[PDB]
Each structure stands twice: as C-alpha cells, then as structure tokens.
C-alpha cells in the first residue's frame, strides 16, 4: 500500500465587482456646499 503524498495550490481573484462608480459622490457634496454658501 504505497501512500503518503502531497500537493500544490493556486488561487483566483473572485472579487471582480467594481467599486469606483459608487465612490464618486463628490459632486453632490459640491452642490450642497453651493447651497450652504
């Protein structure tokens, strides 16, 4: 009964979903800053 072995591993970047689009909220702050001005 030959046995006792090993292995190697790899990975994958699964969080492909973009996030930059929802982070460009600056313009709304600019408009409300103008309102407060």
């Amino acid at each position: 009964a030959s046995g006792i072995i090993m292995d190697s591993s790899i990975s994958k970047q699964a969080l492909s979903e973009i996030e930059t689009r929802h982070s460009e909220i600056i313009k709304l702050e600019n408009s409300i800053r103008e309102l407060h001005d």
């Binding site: 969080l15 979903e17 973009i18 996030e19 929802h22």
Partner: peptide, 22 residues
C-alpha cells in the same frame, strides 16, 4: 427608495452609508 448602495462589497461600510443617504 429601499437603499442607495449596491452591496457588491458587503461589509458594514456600505450599510451605514446607505442609511445616512436615506
């Protein structure tokens, strides 16, 4: 209108965000 941020990232950072906007 039921939310403002698409929770693609999950995590708490999004949740609070949404509420504030509302």
């Amino acid at each position: 209108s039921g939310g403002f941020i698409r929770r693609v990232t999950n995590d708490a950072r999004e949740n609070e965000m949404d509420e504030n906007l509302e």
